[PDB]
Amino acid sequence: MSSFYTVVGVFIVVSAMSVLFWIMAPKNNQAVWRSTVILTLAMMFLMWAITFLCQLHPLVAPRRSDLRP
Amino acid sequence: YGIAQYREINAGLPTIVTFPFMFAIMFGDMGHGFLMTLAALSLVLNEKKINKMKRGEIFDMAFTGRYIILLMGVFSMYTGFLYNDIFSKTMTIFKSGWKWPDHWKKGESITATSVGTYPIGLDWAWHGTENALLFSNSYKMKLSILMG
Amino acid sequence: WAVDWVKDGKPAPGLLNMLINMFLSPGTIDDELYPHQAKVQVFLLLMALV
Amino acid sequence: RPVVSTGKAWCCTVLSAFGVVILSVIAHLFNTNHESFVGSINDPEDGPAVAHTVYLAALVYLVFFVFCGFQVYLAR
Amino acid sequence: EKEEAIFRSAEMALVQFYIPQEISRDSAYTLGQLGLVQFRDLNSKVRA
Amino acid sequence: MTELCPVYAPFFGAIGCASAIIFTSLGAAYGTAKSGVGICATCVLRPDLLFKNIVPVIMAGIIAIYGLVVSVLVCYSLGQKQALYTGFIQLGAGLSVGLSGLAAGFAIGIVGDAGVRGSSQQPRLFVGMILILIFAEVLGLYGLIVALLLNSRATQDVV
Amino acid sequence: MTELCPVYAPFFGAIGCASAIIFTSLGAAYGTAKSGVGICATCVLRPDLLFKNIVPVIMAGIIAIYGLVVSVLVCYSLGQKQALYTGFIQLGAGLSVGLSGLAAGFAIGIVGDAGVRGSSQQPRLFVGMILILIFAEVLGLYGLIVALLLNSRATQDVVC
Amino acid sequence: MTELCPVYAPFFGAIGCASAIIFTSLGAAYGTAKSGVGICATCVLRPDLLFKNIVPVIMAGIIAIYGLVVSVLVCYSLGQKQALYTGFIQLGAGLSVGLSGLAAGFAIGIVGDAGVRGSSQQPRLFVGMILILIFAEVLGLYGLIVALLLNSRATQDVV
Amino acid sequence: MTELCPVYAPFFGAIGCASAIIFTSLGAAYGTAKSGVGICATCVLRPDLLFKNIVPVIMAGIIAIYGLVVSVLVCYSLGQKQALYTGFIQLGAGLSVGLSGLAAGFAIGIVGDAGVRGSSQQPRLFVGMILILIFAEVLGLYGLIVALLLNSRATQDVVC
Amino acid sequence: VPVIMAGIIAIYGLVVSVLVCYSLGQKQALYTGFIQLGAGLSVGLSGLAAGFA
Amino acid sequence: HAQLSSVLWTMTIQIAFGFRGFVGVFMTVALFAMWFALTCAVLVLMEGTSAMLHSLRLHWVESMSKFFVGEGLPYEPFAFEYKDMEV
């Protein structure tokens, strides 16, 4: 939201699902299904974890639309 | 590329995951990804008879990896989602909050302070002048290195 | 990314400036990212290279 | 028939089909005052209520679609 | 009955065969369908 | 005018984008032509493998888009009231990218000429062809990296 | 008259406008020549594919159209009181399109002759060779796309 | 402006940045192109030399990186306020690195071609080729080190 | 600025500093390749004598060291306020070593290759060619000493 | 007929030169001093390329 | 990709914005059709083709460099298959 410590809170929630699924996997091709999704979600989250634009020093773009006649 | 020696780990899962995510992060236009996935869905649903019908010269490899383009696109749409680009457009899904005066005439640099950006993706505020581009490029050239 | 710099007296160090210092200087960082880090960066480097 | 799916009639049908799908949303955007097409110093300012032109444009697409789909459906 | 694609690899073996000569074609029909079978060509350094 | 901004400052920026696109265009054209001639000559006796022999030209095409993107990026920051700094750095980046692209184009063409002959006998060395020729795009792209790095500083105030 | 826009801005405008066609002609001529020189024998061998053999020359022609449109657009916006800035812009655009088209013509010319003779023995190499030759015009179009927007930019930002 | 900080001083800084990578990219491209034809010609005969012929192609990338490591370093010292001295010190390093890299690329391609020529005839000589290749790298950093010495040193003492 | 210490002397200073490395390195690389071709040619024929004929390249590899030592020795005396006398000498000093190294590299590169190629027939030709190659590299040596006192008097006669 | 193609190409050098010659004078605005040679050079080079091909 | 998409959008939609209901609608239709023709063909095919092979680079030369430190010969059990018209 606005606090960068929220990253740890939203990280632990996904890590819990990851560890839970590592144990619970469908029996159909279980030994590869249990390992695929856990990586399909890893960066899936990590690259989102860095999208946070907060704590930004650089200036923000001047406005161009909203003509304001 | 080459076979591995005896009892040498094969990079099956790395191929399943990384290469599609790489291709997705290559480009993420919503329309382009959706359109590309349209052909993938058509091919996979018609595979009932395509599997048996003759594969054209240009269609041999295409039919070979019909299930790959699906992953390509399903990751491309997400990768572009954080970029908030649909043919260079954005509906301002979330709200971030930005400061502007009561009135302003263009041609002047206008500063807007941050009180919290989009929880997911980047805010629409970077749709302005070259300042937005020269911030976005610096932002993006770092995450690539980190992820690599 | 975590710690801001406008509110802090220390200005934001350059995106990539901690490279030349590790070699020419015996530990002088000149970017002031962290005080104690100055005396341990060269130490980490010397374990790495040895 | 003179033009069929192998005569690229199906290509014409699919080409015409995917026009209204976005002309509808662009007409909605014009109807709304999203100022993402006219509310700028450089953008032409004829008023957001110009969705009538785009809506008119969307009309002809069904003309091609319905005509060219019936023949191919007869083929299948 | 497979590998995990992370740590477990393929594990296999080789043997010396002592098959009867008369069932060579008989055995071939069977193992030729799907047997995961390959031969170490001892018939080397020989001409047609 | 002031020594900061003489009259003909924007001339350099204007010529920069043209040169940047143009050198890359020359390099890409040379490479693609010299490769395609060989590919089409060879495929006659190996026509089955035409499609897998097309990778070199689609590879070489990227230099053109590199030039286009750098040229448009430079053009976005053109003006007559700009700083003479912002007249020279533009041409510097443009010529860097152009010459890098030209070198990459020559290398790719030279390698591809013999690659197809090598593959003309057996299909194994497809990987070898790609591996040998896949070290030129890095050269061609380093110019783009440095160009975008330089032009970033351009935006700073003229004073 | 000011220190910004001397009288030889129209010099640059006119030279750029002329250059917009001064080169494309050379590339188109080179491509057409190097295609026609070889097309003759192949047509002689099989007097049935000349219609299918028109693709190289026609595809080489459109670079001339590329040059023509650029020249006409530049001519639309020529004057004498314009800022020298605009003159420099037009000068750049002209050559940028021109010898880019020249490079495209040189590239297509060398490959047209190779492609035509291949068909004489491989009937279905026709589809193959067109893929290769497309990239020539794909390259050529970039000069036009950059130049049209450069010309557009040359208009709004003016001072005299 | 002051005689020590003229208006055209950063022109040298801007040009040198491009030249430093240009004079290395051309050399790397030439070397890799020369090696590619030889490796492609040889691999078909002896079907195992792909993996054990990777040295020169990666040394080309090393030269490419050698370009960037110096090119980027000089960027942040540039500006409209530094002295003409800054431009001189920048261009000196740029030309030094560029020409040293060009010499390295000129030698490496020829030596690699010669070495791979006998590769299909001396399966023993899978390390003796690297002998000269590394010994040909004696000058591969002299330009780099002198450029680093100049840049980080003369980046001060404005007066 | 003053007449004895103008602002464009650092141009000559920097060119002199950076010119010594260039030509010496070029000659070194030229000799390296032109001789290593001979080693590669002889190795297949003689896979027995492959660690006893590397003298030519290594001897050709010392001129680079010479050019580097002179270069850095000049460089460490780099500063803004220098007399025009300071900038005058350095360019000559750098170019002298550069071209002397180039000249030595050419001769060593060709002679070492010729000798190593011809040595495969008769064994004793090795010691025969050693002296001529070492003298060829000594030719390069002779430039450095002159450069030395050149640098020394670049400041031993300091006036203003 | 290719020879008459060449002749028709050559006619261009006259059908244009006469026009510009019709509009030359002593006192001329410098703006209308370069456009003429701009047109002439373009026509000349186009003719040269056509003839070569 | 971002820049090329932006420039194509700018040169297509703005041109299409010509306000006219008597001849402008047909112009909009033609521009709309060519915009699709280019979006599907040249803003997708070449880009994806380049992207997949660049990703193949980024995977191979990075992982396999230290991953496939060895080579093993292939296994191909003898099995029946179809054959058809050929030499």
Coil vs helix vs strand at I152: helix
I150: left (phi over 0), alpha (psi -120 to 50) or beta: alpha
Nearest CA in chain A to E5: A32
- Contact flag I43-H111 (C-beta cutoff 8 Å): no
Q: What are the φ and ψ backbone dihedral angles of B61, each rounded to 5 degrees?
A: -65, -40
d(CA J37, CA K25): 42
- Spatial distance between the Cα atoms of B83 and B122, rounded to a whole number of angstroms: 6
- Cβ–Cβ gap A66/D45 under 8 Å: no
Q: State which amino acid sits at residue F82.
A: Q
Q: Are D75 and D4 in contact, with CB atoms under 8 Å apart?
A: yes
- Write the CA distances from I40 to D36, D64, F101, integer angstroms: 68, 72, 33
Q: How far apart are CA F46 and CA H65, in angstroms?
A: 39
Do the Cβ atoms of F51 and B130 come within 8 Å?
no
8 Å CB contact of B12 and E5 = yes
* Helix (H/G/I), strand (E/B), else coil: J3: helix
Q: Do F37 and G143 lie within an 8 Å CB cutoff?
A: no
Instruction: For residues H44 and H57, give the distance between their C-alpha atoms in angstroms, rounded to a whole number.
Output: 18
CA distance H92 to H70: 12
Cα E39 from chain centroid (whole Å): 5
The four Cα atoms B71, B77, B82, B84 give a dihedral, to 10 degrees, of 170
Q: Which DSSP letter does residue B56 get?
A: P
Gap between the Cα atoms of E11 and E1, Å rounded: 12
Q: Does residue H156 sit at the C interface (CB-CB below 8 Å)?
A: no
Residues of chain C positioned with their CB less than 8 A from the CB of H152: 20, 24
Q: What are phi and psi of I2, to 5 degrees?
A: -130, 160
Hey, what's the torsion of the CAs at B133, B134, B137, B138, to 10 degrees? -150
Residue with tokens 């370009």: H67
Evaluate whether K50 touches E3 at the Cβ level (below 8 Å). no
Q: Do B12 and E9 touch (CB under 8 A)?
A: no
Q: Is B142 left (phi over 0), alpha (psi -120 to 50) or beta?
A: alpha
Residue B7 — left, alpha, or beta (φ > 0 → left; ψ -120 to 50 → alpha)?
A: left
From the number of C-beta atoms within 10 Å of its C-beta (0-12, 13-18, 19+), residue B130 rates as middle
Q: What are phi and psi of D40, to 5 degrees?
A: -150, 160
- Please name the chains neighbouring G, where neighbouring means 3+ C-beta pairs under 8 angstroms: F, J, K
To 5 degrees, how large is the angle CA K16–CA B34–CA D53? Answer: 25
- Give the C-alpha separation, D46 to D53, whole Å: 12
Asked if residues G145 and G138 have their Cβ atoms less than 8 Å apart, the reply is: no
Round to whole Å and give the CA distance between K79 and E30: 10
Is K7 an interface residue toward F (CB < 8 Å)?
A: yes
DSSP string covering C1-50, please? --S-SSSSSSPPPPTT-SSTHHHHSSS--SS-S-HHHHHHHHHHHHHHH-
Lookup: tokens for G34? 């190097």
Question: Residue H76: which residues within 8 A CB-CB, separation 6 or more?
Answer: C14, C17
| Residue D60 to residue D52: CA distance in whole angstroms | 14
Under an 8 A CB cutoff, do B8 and E6 touch? no
Residue E28 in 3-state DSSP?
helix
Among all chains, which residue has been given the structure tokens 């299948």?
A: D76
* Chain E residue with minimum CA distance to K72: E10
Query: Is F21 within 8 Å of G143 when comparing Cβ atoms?
Result: yes
The residues, ordered by sequence, that sit 6+ positions from D42 with a Cβ below 8 Å of its Cβ are none
> CA H31 to CA B3: how far, in whole Å?
30
Q: Which residues contact H13 (CB under 8 A, 6 or more apart)?
A: H74, H77, H78, H82, H86, H87, H90, H91
CA I10-I13-I15 angle, to 5 degrees, is 110
User: Which residues of chain C are within 8 Å of residue H76 when distances are taken between CB atoms?
Assistant: 14, 17
Cα Rg of chain I, angstroms? 20
- Cβ under 8 Å to G: K residues 28-67: 42, 46
CB B120 within 8 A of CB B83: no
Please count the structural domains in chain G: 1
What residue type is assigned to position G123 of the chain?
A: P
C-beta atoms of K75 and E33 within 8 A: no
A65 strand-pairing partners? D40
By C-alpha distance, which of K19, K3, K23, K1 is closest to K11? Answer: K3
Three-class SS of residue I2? strand
Kindly list the residues from chain A whose CB atom is less than 8 angstroms away from the CB atom of residue C5. 57
Which residues in chain C touch residue A55, judged by CB atoms under 8 angstroms apart? 1-4
Structure tokens at H48: 């195992």
Cα–Cα distances in angstroms (integers) from residue H145 to residues C21, G109, I68, I87, I100, in the given order: 15, 47, 10, 23, 22
Would you state the structure tokens that stand for residue C40, as one six-digit string? 């341990």
Q: After which residues is chain F broken (C to N over 2.5 A)?
A: none
Resolution of the structure in the document, Å: 4.2
How far, in Å, CA of J16 to CA of J9, rounded? Answer: 12
Q: How was this structure determined?
A: cryo-EM
Which burial class, exposed, middle or buried, applies to B136 when counting CB atoms under 10 A from its CB (0-12, 13-18, 19+)?
Answer: middle
Residues K78, E34: C-beta atoms closer than 8 Å: no
Q: Which of B83, B92, D45, B118 is nearest to A66 (CA)?
A: D45
Q: Do chains G and C touch (3 or more CB pairs under 8 A)?
A: no
SS3 assignment, position G96: helix
Rounded Cα distance between J39 and J16, Å, is 9
How far apart CA J22 and CA J14 sit, in angstroms, is 12
Task: Report whether I31 contacts I57 (CB < 8 A).
Answer: yes
Please, what is the angle between helix H9-45 and helix F137-154, to 10°?
160
- Other beta carbons within 10 angstroms of residue J35's beta carbon come to 18
C-alpha span between F65 and F57 (Å, rounded): 13
> Do residues H96 and H147 touch, judged by C-beta distance below 8 A?
yes
Q: Across-strand partners of D40? A: A65
- The answer to whether E6 and B13 have CB atoms below 8 angstroms apart is yes
Check if the beta carbon of residue F25 is closer than 8 Å to that of residue F64: yes
8 A C-beta contact, residue G115 and residue G56: yes
Q: Is I52 helix (H, G, I), strand (E, B) or coil?
A: coil
Most E-contacting residue of B3, B5, B6 (CB-CB within 10 A), to test interface: B6
CA J5 to each of CA H2, J10, J50: distance values in angstroms, whole numbers, following the listed order: 66, 9, 10
Burial G101-131 (b: 16+ CB within 10 A, else e): bbbbbbbbbbbbbbbbbbbbebeebbebbee
Nearest alpha carbon to residue G102 among J41, J45, K46, H30: J45
Tokens (6 digits) for B86: 């649909």
Query: How many CB atoms within 10 Å of residue K79?
Result: 11
**Amino acid identity, residue D8?**
K
The answer to whether the beta carbons of residues G17 and G74 sit under 8 Å apart is yes
Contact between B94 and B123 (Cβ < 8 Å): yes
Structural domain boundaries in chain D: 4-72
Query: What's the rounded Cα separation, in Å, for the pair G115 and I28?
Result: 46
Q: How far apart are alpha carbons A26 and A34 in whole angstroms?
A: 8
Check: CB of residue H113 under 8 Å from CB of residue H34.
Answer: yes
Range of the domain at G27: 1-159
Backbone discontinuities in chain I, residue before each (C to N > 2.5 A) = none
Q: Quick check: G87 and F12 in contact, CB under 8 A?
A: no
**Alpha carbon distances (Å) from H9 to C30, I82, K61:** 27, 18, 42
Looking at the complex, report in whole angstroms how far the Cα of residue K79 sits from the nearest Cα belonging to chain B: 20
Which of F126, B33, G129, G110 has its CA nearest to residue K53? F126
CA distance H144 to H69: 9
State whether residue G10 is helix, strand or coil. Answer: helix
Contact check, Cβ <8 Å, B106/D41: yes
Task: For residues F68 and G96, give the distance between their C-alpha atoms in angstroms, rounded to a whole number.
Answer: 11
Residue of E nearest to K75 (CA): E38
Distance of CA H117 to the CA centre of its chain: 25
| Burial track I129-159 (b if 16+ CB lie within 10 A, e otherwise) | beeebeebbeebeebbeebeebbeebeeeee
Cα angle value K55/K59/K65 (rounded, 5°) = 145
C-alpha to C-alpha distance for I52 and I115, rounded to whole angstroms: 13
Burial class (CB in 10 A: 0-12, 13-18, 19+), H135: middle
User: Which chain D residue is nearest to residue B86, measuring alpha carbons?
Assistant: D22
* Among the listed residues C49, C23, C8, the one whose alpha carbon sits nearest the alpha carbon of residue C33: C8
Residue at token pair 């091609």:
D64
Contact residues on chain A for B76, CB-CB shorter than 8 A: none
